Design a binder for this molecule. Structure first.
Ligand SMILES: [K+]
Ligand SMILES: [K+]
Ligand SMILES: [K+]
Ligand SMILES: [K+]
Ligand SMILES: [K+]
Ligand SMILES: [K+]
Ligand SMILES: [K+]
Ligand SMILES: [K+]
Ligand SMILES: [Mg+2]
Ligand SMILES: [Mg+2]
Ligand SMILES: [Mg+2]
Ligand SMILES: [Mg+2]
Ligand SMILES: [Mg+2]
Ligand SMILES: [Mg+2]
Ligand SMILES: [Mg+2]
Ligand SMILES: [Mg+2]
Ligand SMILES: [Mg+2]
Ligand SMILES: [Mg+2]
Ligand SMILES: [Mg+2]
Ligand SMILES: [Mg+2]
Ligand SMILES: [Mg+2]
Ligand SMILES: [Mg+2]
Ligand SMILES: [Mg+2]
Ligand SMILES: [Mg+2]
Ligand SMILES: [Mg+2]
Ligand SMILES: [Mg+2]
Ligand SMILES: [Mg+2]
Ligand SMILES: [Mg+2]
Ligand SMILES: [Mg+2]
Ligand SMILES: [Mg+2]
Ligand SMILES: [Mg+2]
Ligand SMILES: [Mg+2]
Ligand SMILES: [Mg+2]
Ligand SMILES: [Mg+2]
Ligand SMILES: [Mg+2]
Ligand SMILES: [Mg+2]
Ligand SMILES: [Mg+2]
Ligand SMILES: [Mg+2]
Ligand SMILES: [Mg+2]
Ligand SMILES: [Mg+2]
Ligand SMILES: [Mg+2]
Ligand SMILES: [Mg+2]
Ligand SMILES: [Mg+2]
Ligand SMILES: [Mg+2]
Ligand SMILES: [Mg+2]
Ligand SMILES: [Mg+2]
Ligand SMILES: [Mg+2]
Lengths: 103, 150, 142, 48, 110, 56, 117
RNA sequence: CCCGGCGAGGGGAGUGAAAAAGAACCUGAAACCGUGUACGUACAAGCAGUGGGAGCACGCUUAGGCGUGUGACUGCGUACC
RNA sequence: GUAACGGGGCUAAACCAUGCACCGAAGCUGCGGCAGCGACGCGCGUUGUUGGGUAGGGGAGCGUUCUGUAAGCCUGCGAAGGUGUGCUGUGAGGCAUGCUGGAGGUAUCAGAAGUGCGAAUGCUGACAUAAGUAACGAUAAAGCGGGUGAAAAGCCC
């Protein structure tokens, strides 16, 4: 069984028990999050396709962790023009564990 | 730098970077580009700013309970052990002692105690008022500092 | 999750047999190139050969439009100065007919090691017989 | 009031320019003199 | 049980000595001694004396039998170069490097 | 004529891939003395093919 | 106040050489060359965070096209059909479904074809 | 004491807190040169990386993936001042 | 050297007309984050908006040596330095710790500068490359026996 949902301006195909990394959610760790905009639920040969969302479709997940991703270095360099600039970046994430998919 | 003014090698044709002086600051053993000379680092302090600073310091010592006023501060003999005993009696270790007349006995008793200094009221300076943990002033010294600043 | 990638160890490649008789050279070649690369499979992966093995029969009977049979020229240079050589399509068909299809397909495959590996799966024959009965090729109508 | 708890007034102590110490400074390389000409030179410039 | 011998500051470039060292790496010591005997290189004489020293060290200091010993490790490191002046034509001086090598031989039963 | 670019340690090693010495394949054993020797050469003790050809 | 540079200079050079690990020849050994290599690696990495998004979408599209054509429709008609059906599943997910759940992909195609009908 | 030319040089022994403090001696960087091990590399074209990525080896705490090294194949890509 | 579609190839995969789809950028939108400026209200909010840059102007910082704070604090139960590893900040950087090292180091807040290097056919030292390549200096010339020696084309007879 799996479902497709939108979060963080991106889409995710998930099954129950999976941990998925999302853009940061403003929700405390060890708390439940509901995704009620489910684009698709497939339980084998049974396929519910949202138009755009599945009727009654809900994914429940628990927030396991917040954190910052691996550091990315931004390098800008304009050869022969005496210009260089560097910046670091770490992107925030929220990890959620999928607890239930239903309609 | 000690050495000759001879051009180390001719201007052109050797395939080397052009050289003018063995004393060039680019060279090992060469001059220092902006070689230091002796300097006078002293600053002007406006008299009123000096006196204003001392008043701020003394007022702050009073607020922080670091200024201790006494009638008398004396030792009978030029004995370090006597002054050490006097200060532990008064529960002082690190202390600037300001007197009206700087007596020989107290000056001599204080010399070998590095945490203790003994001034006359004329010899106060801003750093020492701040640097010592406590300042002990005789009633006499308080009057003289009163008159000096007023 | 990360996007799926085909794995060279696990890729399934089927065997097909195509008859070139009367087929337009370039329109046959694009379908061959597509299938040698694996562009027809959902498992398509740019760095993996996911394509199929293709036997082409009757390469000598491949068709071309216009005046190409006489006027299409194949040039090659030998690497020796002045060594520019040429053959018309009709001369190529007479002498080395399998090369017409092979040349057309090679130019439509990616350049580089993987493209050369993809080309090795094409088996071109001049006539109506191949020796690959053991691979059990399925008829493919292009 | 200790010798390690005194601070100057805000704005009283601006840091001097240091020319020719790299790109990030904004005064690297030419040190604010631009490119060539008499004014770029050591001792260079015309009289009052 | 490993036993070492070294010739430090040997008068030969490491490049030349390494040609010979490569012949005997991993060999039984009796075979190594035979190889070196019939190698017509100055470095074979140098390496053979180090190998013979290593064997004598193993027997005397570490109680080994020659019969069990192999050349477990052998390597040549670059030693200090002696710098010399070679006059060339037209008053030009060249540097000559007289290269030296540090020869290490390790023998072991294991 | 001289290089325009410094050749690499890699290229140096590749050129030297043919510099390796070859060990004498095998030594012969004199039938009388039992001494090892280079084939077709006399032994160190002056034997050749079992005969004392050279004294000392 | 003479300042010697050695400790700081060493730390700066070592920082660059550590980022040049794995590079060929002087590029992992020699500061002057390693510095240029590390800058260029940074320039490419910046560019390729943008290119990665292009390359993956290109891959998803190619796979959707293959799977759509196995179900009797072109990519371009399939996408149009999904939009007319108000299906908002993105190409990453469609390409994932195309590989891992072919029956579900077929159901998406039938939905697309019905919207075009 | 032992190998060696009654060498050079070395291995033990002994001194010492330490001898990888042994006089070529405090620390002992880098370039540069080696030995060992893992992985890659003999149908393959270019600033040598970067994005993607299989396989192999070795670790590791769900038995799971994860980490570390390597990097077939592939998109893009002509150093710096 | 094909060499006047980028190539394959194409009789449309050409051209003209009409239409609907789709691809396509660091543009626009979505989601998360940082910062500048202006409003509007209480240094925090809400709101709008901006953030490609050479010369160049403005603003704010990192780190180094030295002075005070410091007869303090850390340090032989291991300082500085060296070398790894992990963590960490937008950056210069910072912190922790294994190994090496074997006696110094120095918070904080201030103060002063010989304060930061890849270039200057820069300067000094070290070490590469070409390369085990050229060369070994008059083409008067050597051969053998014996000796000595660890070893003899070169020494001695
Ligand atoms: K001089
Ligand atoms: K005193
Ligand atoms: K200026
Ligand atoms: K690549
Ligand atoms: K340390
Ligand atoms: K300090
Ligand atoms: K230079
Ligand atoms: K060489
Ligand atoms: Mg000097
Ligand atoms: Mg005055
Ligand atoms: Mg291409
Ligand atoms: Mg500027
Ligand atoms: Mg200029
Ligand atoms: Mg001009
Ligand atoms: Mg100007
Ligand atoms: Mg001048
Ligand atoms: Mg002369
Ligand atoms: Mg040139
Ligand atoms: Mg050779
Ligand atoms: Mg100093
Ligand atoms: Mg290295
Ligand atoms: Mg000795
Ligand atoms: Mg040591
Ligand atoms: Mg010492
Ligand atoms: Mg030392
Ligand atoms: Mg191969
Ligand atoms: Mg080939
Ligand atoms: Mg090549
Ligand atoms: Mg390219
Ligand atoms: Mg021609
Ligand atoms: Mg074109
Ligand atoms: Mg885009
Ligand atoms: Mg934008
Ligand atoms: Mg902009
Ligand atoms: Mg800007
Ligand atoms: Mg200090
Ligand atoms: Mg300086
Ligand atoms: Mg330098
Ligand atoms: Mg520069
Ligand atoms: Mg040289
Ligand atoms: Mg040559
Ligand atoms: Mg020659
Ligand atoms: Mg010659
Ligand atoms: Mg001569
Ligand atoms: Mg003789
Ligand atoms: Mg001798
Ligand atoms: Mg002679």
């Amino acid at each position: 069984m799996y479902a497709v949902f939108q979060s963080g301006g991106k889409q995710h195909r998930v099954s129950e028990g999976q941990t998925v990394r999302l853009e940061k959610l403003d929700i405390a760790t060890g708390e439940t999050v509901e995704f009620a905009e489910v684009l698709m639920i497939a339980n084998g040969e049974e396929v519910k396709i949202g138009v755009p969302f599945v009727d009654g479709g809900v994914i429940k997940a628990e927030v396991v962790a917040h954190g910052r991703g691996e550091k990315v270095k931004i390098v800008k360099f304009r050869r022969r023009k005496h210009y260089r600039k560097q910046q670091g970046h770490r992107q925030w994430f929220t990890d959620v564990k999928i607890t239930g998919i239903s309609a | 730098v000690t050495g000759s003014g001879k051009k180390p090698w001719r201007q052109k044709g050797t395939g080397r970077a052009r050289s003018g002086s063995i004393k060039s600051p680019i060279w090992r053993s060469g001059g220092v580009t902006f070689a230091a000379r002796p300097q006078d680092h002293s600053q002007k302090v406006n008299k009123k700013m000096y006196r204003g600073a001392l008043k701020s310091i003394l007022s702050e010592l009073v607020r922080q309970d670091r200024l201790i006023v006494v009638e008398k501060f004396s030792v009978e003999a030029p004995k370090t052990k006597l002054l050490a005993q006097k200060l532990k009696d008064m529960a002082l270790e690190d202390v600037l002692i300001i007197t009206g007349e700087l007596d020989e006995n107290l000056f001599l008793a204080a010399r070998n105690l590095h945490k203790v200094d003994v001034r006359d009221a004329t010899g106060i300076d801003p750093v020492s008022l701040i640097a010592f943990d406590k300042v002990v002033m005789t009633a006499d010294a308080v009057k003289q500092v009163e008159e000096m600043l007023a | 999750m990360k996007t799926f990638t085909a794995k060279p160890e696990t890729v399934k490649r089927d065997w097909y047999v195509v008859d070139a008789t009367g087929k337009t050279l370039g329109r046959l070649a694009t379908e061959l190139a597509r299938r040698l690369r694996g562009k027809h499979k959902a498992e398509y992966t740019p760095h993996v050969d996911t394509g199929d093995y293709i036997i082409v029969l009757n390469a000598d009977k491949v068709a071309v439009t216009g005046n190409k049979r006489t006027d299409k020229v194949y040039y090659h240079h030998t690497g020796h100065i002045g060594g520019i050589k040429q053959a018309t399509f009709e001369e190529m068909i007479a002498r080395r007919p399998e090369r017409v299809i092979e040349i057309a397909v090679k130019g439509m495959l990616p350049k580089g090691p993987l493209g050369r590996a993809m080309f090795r799966k094409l088996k071109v024959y001049a006539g109506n017989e191949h020796n690959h009965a053991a691979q059990q090729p399925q008829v493919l109508d292009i | 009031m200790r010798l390690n708890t005194l601070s100057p007034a805000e704005g009283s102590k601006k840091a001097g320019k240091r020319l020719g110490r790299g790109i990030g400074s904004g005064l690297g390389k030419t040190g604010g003199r631009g490119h060539k000409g008499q004014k770029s030179r050591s001792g260079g410039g015309v009289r009052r | 049980m490993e036993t070492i011998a070294k010739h430090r500051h040997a008068r030969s470039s490491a490049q030349k000595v390494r040609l010979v060292a490569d012949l005997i790496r991993g060999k039984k010591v009796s075979q190594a001694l035979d190889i070196l005997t019939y190698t017509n290189k100055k470095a074979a004489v140098l390496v053979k004396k180090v190998l013979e020293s290593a064997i004598a060290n193993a027997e005397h200091n570490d109680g080994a039998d020659i019969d069990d010993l192999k050349v477990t490790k052998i390597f040549v490191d670059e030693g200090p170069s002696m710098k010399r002046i070679m006059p060339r034509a037209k008053g030009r001086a060249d540097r000559i490097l007289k290269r030296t090598s540090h020869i290490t031989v390790v023998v072991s039963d294991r | 004529a001289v290089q325009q670019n410094k050749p690499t340690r890699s290229k140096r090693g590749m050129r030297r891939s043919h510099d390796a010495l070859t060990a004498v394949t095998s030594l012969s054993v004199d039938k009388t003395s039992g001494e090892k020797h280079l084939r077709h050469h006399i032994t160190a003790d002056g034997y050749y093919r079992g005969r004392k050809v050279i004294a000392k | 106040a003479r300042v010697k540079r050695g400790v700081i200079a060493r730390a700066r050079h070592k920082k660059i050489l550590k980022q040049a690990k794995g590079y060929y020849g002087a590029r992992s050994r020699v500061y002057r060359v390693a510095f240029q290599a590390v800058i260029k690696a940074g320039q490419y990495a910046y560019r390729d965070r943008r290119q990665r998004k292009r390359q993956f979408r290109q891959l998803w599209i190619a796979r959707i096209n293959a799977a759509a054509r196995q179900n009797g429709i072109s990519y371009s008609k399939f996408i149009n059909g999904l939009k007319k059906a108000s299906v908002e599943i993105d190409r990453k997910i469609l390409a994932d479904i195309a590989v891992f759940d072919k029956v579900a992909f077929t159901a998406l195609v039938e939905k697309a074809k019905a919207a075009l009908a």
